[PDB]
Design a protein around this nucleic acid. Structure first.
Ligand code: MG
Ligand code: MG
Ligand code: MG
Ligand code: MG
Ligand code: MG
Ligand code: MG
Ligand code: MG
Ligand code: MG
Ligand code: MG
Ligand code: MG
Ligand code: MG
Ligand code: MG
Ligand code: MG
Ligand code: MG
Ligand code: MG
Ligand code: MG
Ligand code: MG
Ligand code: MG
Ligand code: MG
Ligand code: MG
Ligand code: MG
Ligand code: MG
Ligand code: MG
Ligand code: MG
Ligand code: MG
Ligand code: MG
Ligand code: MG
Ligand code: MG
Ligand code: MG
Lengths: 102, 141, 68, 140, 144, 62, 72, 206, 84
RNA sequence: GCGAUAACGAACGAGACCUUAACCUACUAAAUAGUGCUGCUAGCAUUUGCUGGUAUAGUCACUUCUUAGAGGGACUAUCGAUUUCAAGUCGAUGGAAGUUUGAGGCAAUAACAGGUCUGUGAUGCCCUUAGACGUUCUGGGCCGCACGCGCGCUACACUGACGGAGCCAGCGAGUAUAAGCCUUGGCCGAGAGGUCUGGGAAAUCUUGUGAAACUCCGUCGUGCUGGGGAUAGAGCAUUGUAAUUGUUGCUCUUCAACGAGGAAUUCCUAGUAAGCGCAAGUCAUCAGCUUGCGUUGAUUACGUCCCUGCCCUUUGUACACACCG
């Protein structure tokens, strides 16, 4: 249980904080001589819901088209498990959730 | 230079492999081929009663040659077509499972295909050998 | 149609009355100049302003223009 | 390695990736010769980039394309674009540009879509009708 | 596999199961004139009787015509599947049958009173001449 | 006896629905006798259109 | 209802076919039906043999359309 | 003239095309000429094509249709009546077969006959209506060259379409009969009756 | 879980606070004109670029009515309404 | 907007703005994307070639195709015409894009007795409140059929039906001690469907959703015919506690009107219309419905106020609860 091939999966609705956390981890993985793979832009998922505008059923048939974009990024690190987890606390952000899988 | 299956038109290659497979005669034909229709979406049985099974087995062999571990469920979707729902709009419906499963099972005991790892049915060591042969006897005219 | 609006027509002619010596008859050169002269919120308005400024510059060399 | 250039042509959704290598003039569609393209009535759409310049241009190069997406017709226009763009791109990199500009002249004077991808895409559908502009029949 | 000629052998009008069949119709589709014989059923009796479908009705000889009417009246004896039959799992004797031209409307009728005798809902709507399979009637079927 | 007349000037859309155009025609031979005539289909200048009858002018249409 | 085209080929019509088809600028399924009064199916088998017998030269081959011409 | 050997073999007949571009590699544009001075600029035969299928953008601007190949404008008009809209591959088959029938008959160049049938079918004066909100007031007006050309294609394909309906004659050979008769100006053909009747009514309005 | 309560820095710029404050005044029987102008001036005093208040319903009268009270500069269309 | 100008200079709305689609061999990377090489390996002619499989250690190379973030790129650019030489408009050339680049989202000042208290544990008032108008259980009905009307789906055939064969998308969705999701692959079954395993909380698996129109080759041959498939009889499965008033699917049989539709009337200008399917919503089951998506892909204007509707100016007014005066 030392240096491992470690995956960090990043998902969020907003891209600005996602790229800051993504860039901040890459920055800390640069000055620390840790070989890295990423970030990998997964195809963004558009969660679309199309309802009727009318609470009743009167009027022209008009529809809303709501959206919820989900952006997912995975970054591969080659470092011991203690090092990667403390990096996560360095780059903790409310919007982006992190899951770590070996 | 050599000849492969991909170097011959598909439509007249199958007509040549079908002719060989009928004259060879070793392919086992199930007893209901004179009764059944190819798909539940079809309304009539094939018009080439004596030869339709051979040509379909020839089509199945060529289609498997070009791909990797195709299952029998995928074969039903491929040969299925638009059903003639009376007043409702048309829809795609898969072909009959037994006809395709019997062909690949029949083709498995004639030596052309075999069950591939991780599902599907690969082409046999001899399956490549004998299909490429038929292609050569197709384009000499 | 391609009728420019007032937010681009009046903003472009303020530039000429203020930065005529540095302007030119080239859109590409004018486009870069207005990014350091004006604070434009959107890229599309920046090219639109410079593209009409170029038209006014091209028109000034043929005679006097109204509003400048 | 060797003198290899890789390009692509596109139609509505179809995209054909062309690899142009130095060789004896091998020209295959998904591993099959172009002389056996299924849409027979359109076989001359892919024959156009060949007979326009002359088959002598393909002696030293071999081309293998992989076309996916789109439909049957949309794929034919994607293939002919990848071939035409691939021949031009090879000359620009491994031949003098005088010859590359010569080939591009004949192609453009015959069909813009040989080199320039068509920008037309399907308009989105809007509610209140079964199509982009079409609307449900109205009654009073 | 080529054009052939004949004289005096063609028969313009056929009579099978007390039904008149046009002799210039192809054999597979001529039998569909016989009520109770559809396209799907006619395709198989010709194939079970070794009558190639490329023949017109008048081309057939008497020997072939009798061989077909024998099969239609005894389908199960010629490896015709039970599920392929007109009247399978019969009401009274429970055996698989295929009713034909004159027998069809008689046993179709016998089913109607059998529905009406027990006074079931489906039999009643059959009596009224209305749709029995649940179809809507407020806006369709207004002809006469 | 048809006569051909090249158009030299598109005057404007006339007629009730605007489907007909006033145009100024000049004859290919004998480049004179310029006449104003009405035309049904879409017209640019320099379109070679023949006249079944030549001796008739045109004015604004209803 | 008035068509009543002949579907069985007798001997009087057979040699009339071989005596009339050569004197045609253009023969097809409809041309045979239109002028020889034979059925469409009988025309198709007639065209495929007359080509095999050399009387008729195939201009174009297609399932839905058979374009043929005289061989003389 | 040389036969060029490639690794991917090219048939002999199709190689006979580097010298000249021919319609379906069978029909030459060299010997084709519009027999009317007034429609030369609107019948486009100057740029040869192999197959009447280019998928170009001729509906963007106003007069781009005049730049489309004349055979492609014809195959566009075939695919009508709902069930045929968008079936261009079928339309190309009819045109390809129609030309061969036009070739075996009268032995002329098939696309020369097409040009002759179009110049002979377009009415030169049509009587437009100028009614002032209901009353009948017919007025005789001239016909532009563009509408003259493209109504010929509309009438030629409409006549061929109706001749093949519920008829054993195939559409390709119904088009051939319609095109051949109208090319030689015969009044038996549809779209020649219509052209004369249009020009006849215009004579009854001046 | 941990919950923290934080004071809003600029109470005048929060429409939620201004709407709840107005309700607590309207429910006290205060006149609408005095209540409406109390949020118009409180919003502007905090530094808002603009403010508009609409009150709809029934007040002693059987028929219902709505009244708008604008002030300053207001934008209506496009994305910036989602931003500012 | 130019311009005329007792106006000058402005604000909302429009436009700007935002989302999406089309370009980038110019940056940033990608074993959940792809490729060439390279290991190992198959078939065919042997010329070293052509098609493959394999490859999560070849501990390779690359980012063109794929994904998405930071940017760049179009501003009517240049040149011809017309114009008050103004705002502009029309042509070419270059361009990925020159119709606001294509499409949408948002959208002013007021207003309607427009529609919803059957969306709300949103509501004032009235009614009811224990034999309830609450709520629950059982069964039926909302489908009920002499008829009129509207949104649609199939069709009336040969530019076609079948029968084989060829065989291409995009938008999306998917579960656990449940109350059961998407389901390949194998094996049964003519089918519908059944069964055994495995994968996938997902760019990984279903899935390249091998879709349908479409194309090729055949049968049919102008015939209410092999067009069309209502209506109905008998039988086989699925879902569900429960299918009778057939949920749906499948098999055989019956095979009706309809032979292109009067007066009228709808939608539509380019990847548009029309076909053609597929996915998502409803959903135990049922999509002839909507919301989207892509395949094939046109004819004809690019004009006008003739009809119709709306806006503006002038005008009349005994209306202002505003002609429902
Ligand atoms: Mg299929
Ligand atoms: Mg199929
Ligand atoms: Mg159908
Ligand atoms: Mg149908
Ligand atoms: Mg026909
Ligand atoms: Mg604004
Ligand atoms: Mg806006
Ligand atoms: Mg504003
Ligand atoms: Mg790997
Ligand atoms: Mg390898
Ligand atoms: Mg827009
Ligand atoms: Mg109301
Ligand atoms: Mg009301
Ligand atoms: Mg309530
Ligand atoms: Mg309530
Ligand atoms: Mg609700
Ligand atoms: Mg109670
Ligand atoms: Mg209801
Ligand atoms: Mg009921
Ligand atoms: Mg509706
Ligand atoms: Mg078919
Ligand atoms: Mg997938
Ligand atoms: Mg039925
Ligand atoms: Mg019938
Ligand atoms: Mg209307
Ligand atoms: Mg239900
Ligand atoms: Mg659904
Ligand atoms: Mg609904
Ligand atoms: Mg007044």
């Amino acid at each position: 249980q030392q240096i491992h091939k470690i995956r960090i999966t990043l998902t969020s609705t907003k891209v600005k904080q996602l790229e800051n956390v993504s860039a901040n981890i890459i920055r800390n993985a640069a000055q620390y001589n840790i070989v890295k793979k990423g970030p990998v832009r997964m195809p963004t998922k558009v969660l679309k819901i199309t309802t009727r505008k009318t609470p009743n059923g009167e009027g022209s048939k008009t529809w809303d088209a709501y959206e919820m974009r989900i952006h997912k990024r995975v970054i591969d690190l080659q470092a011991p498990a203690s090092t990667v987890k403390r990096i996560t606390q360095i780059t903790i952000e409310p919007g982006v959730d992190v899951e770590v899988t070996i | 230079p050599g000849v492969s299956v991909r170097d011959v038109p598909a439509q007249d290659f199958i007509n040549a492999y079908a002719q060989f497979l009928q004259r060879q005669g070793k392919l086992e034909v199930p007893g209901y081929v004179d009764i059944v229709k190819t798909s539940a979406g079809n309304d009539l049985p094939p018009q080439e009663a004596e030869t339709w099974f051979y040509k379909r087995a020839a089509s199945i062999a060529r289609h498997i040659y070009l791909r990797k571990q195709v299952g029998v469920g995928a074969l039903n979707k491929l040969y299925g077509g638009a059903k003639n729902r009376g007043f409702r709009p048309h829809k795609h419906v898969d072909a009959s499972g037994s006809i395709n499963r019997k062909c690949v099972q029949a083709l498995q005991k004639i030596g052309v295909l075999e069950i591939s790892p991780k599902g599907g049915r690969r082409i046999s060591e001899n399956g490549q050998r004998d299909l490429d042969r038929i292609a050569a006897q197709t384009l000499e005219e | 149609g391609r009728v420019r609006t007032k937010t681009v027509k009046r903003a472009s002619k303020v530039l000429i009355e203020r930065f005529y010596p540095k302007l030119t008859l080239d859109f590409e050169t004018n486009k870069r100049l207005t990014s350091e002269i004006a604070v434009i919120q959107s890229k599309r308005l920046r090219n639109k302003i410079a593209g009409y400024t170029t038209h006014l510059m091209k028109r000034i060399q043929k005679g006097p223009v109204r509003g400048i | 390695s060797t003198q290899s250039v890789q390009t692509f042509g596109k139609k509505k959704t179809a995209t054909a990736v062309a690899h142009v290598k130095a060789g004896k003039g091998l020209i295959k569609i998904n591993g099959s010769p172009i002389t056996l393209v299924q849409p027979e009535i359109l076989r001359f759409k892919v024959y156009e980039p060949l007979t326009l310049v002359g088959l002598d241009k393909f002696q030293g190069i071999d081309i293998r394309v992989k076309v996916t997406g789109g439909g049957h017709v949309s794929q034919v226009y994607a293939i002919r674009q990848a071939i035409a763009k691939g021949l031009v791109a090879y000359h620009q990199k491994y031949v003098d540009e005088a010859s590359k500009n010569e080939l591009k002249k004949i192609f453009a004077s015959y069909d813009k879509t040989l080199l320039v991808a068509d920008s037309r895409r399907m308009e989105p559908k809007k509610f209140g009708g079964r199509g982009a502009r079409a609307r449900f029949q109205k009654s009073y | 596999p080529l054009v052939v000629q004949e004289q005096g052998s063609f028969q313009h009008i056929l009579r099978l199961l007390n039904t008149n069949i046009d002799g210039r119709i192809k054999i597979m589709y001529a039998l569909t004139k016989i009520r109770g014989v559809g396209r799907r059923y006619a395709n198989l009796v010709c194939k079970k009787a070794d009558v190639e479908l490329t023949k017109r009705a008048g081309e057939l000889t008497q020997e072939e015509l009798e061989r077909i009417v024998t099969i239609m009246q005894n389908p199960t004896n010629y490896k015709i599947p039970a599920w392929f039959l007109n009247r399978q799992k019969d009401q009274v004797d429970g055996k698989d049958y295929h009713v034909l031209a004159n027998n069809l409307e008689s046993k179709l009728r016998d089913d109607l009173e059998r529905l009406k005798k027990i006074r079931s809902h489906r039999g009643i709507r059959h009596f009224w001449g209305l749709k029995v399979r649940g179809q809507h009637t407020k806006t369709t079927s207004r002809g006469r | 006896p048809v006569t051909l007349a090249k158009v030299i000037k598109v005057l404007g859309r006339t007629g009730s629905r605007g489907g007909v155009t006033q145009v100024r025609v000049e004859f290919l031979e004998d480049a004179s006798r310029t006449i104003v005539r009405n035309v049904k289909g879409p017209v640019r200048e320099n379109d070679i259109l023949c006249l079944m009858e030549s001796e008739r002018e045109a004015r604004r249409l209803r | 209802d008035k068509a009543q085209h002949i579907v069985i080929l007798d001997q009087e019509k057979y040699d009339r076919i071989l005596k009339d088809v050569p004197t045609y600028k253009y023969v097809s399924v409809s041309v045979l039906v239109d002028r020889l009064k034979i059925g469409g199916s009988l025309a198709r088998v007639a065209l495929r043999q007359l080509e095999e017998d050399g009387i008729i030269t195939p201009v174009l081959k297609h399932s839905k359309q058979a374009i043929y011409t005289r061989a003389q | 003239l040389q036969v060029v050997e490639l690794a991917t073999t090219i048939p002999l007949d199709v190689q006979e095309a580097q010298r000249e571009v021919k319609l379906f590699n069978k029909w030459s544009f060299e010997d084709v000429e519009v027999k009317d001075v007034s429609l030369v600029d609107y019948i486009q035969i100057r740029n040869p094509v192999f197959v009447s299928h280019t998928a170009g953008k001729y509906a963007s601007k106003r007069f781009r249709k005049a730049q489309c190949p004349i055979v492609e404008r014809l195959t566009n008009s075939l695919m009508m009546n709902g069930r045929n809209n968008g079936k261009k591959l079928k339309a190309v088959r009819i045109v390809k077969h129609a030309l061969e029938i036009i070739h075996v008959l009268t032995e002329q160049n098939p696309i020369q006959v097409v040009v002759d049938a179009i110049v002979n079918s377009g009415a030169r004066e049509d009587s437009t209506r100028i009614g002032s909100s209901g009353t009948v007031r017919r007025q005789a007006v001239d016909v532009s060259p563009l509408r003259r050309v493209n109504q010929a294609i509309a009438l030629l394909t409409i006549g061929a379409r109706e001749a093949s309906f519920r008829n054993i004659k195939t559409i390709a050979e119904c088009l051939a009969e319609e095109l051949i008769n109208a090319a030689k100006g015969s009044s038996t053909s549809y779209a020649i009756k219509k052209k004369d009747e249009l020009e006849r009514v215009a004579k009854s309005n001046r | 879980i941990a919950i923290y309560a934080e004071r809003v820095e600029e109470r005048g710029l929060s429409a939620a606070v201004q709407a709840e404050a107005l309700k607590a005044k309207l429910l006290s029987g205060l006149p609408i004109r005095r209540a409406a102008y109390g949020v118009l001036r409180f919003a502007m005093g905090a530094g808002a670029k603009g403010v508009e208040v609409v009150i709809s319903g029934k007040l002693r009268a059987a028929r219902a009515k709505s009244q708008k009270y604008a002030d300053g500069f207001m934008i209506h269309s496009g994305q910036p309404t989602r931003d500012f």
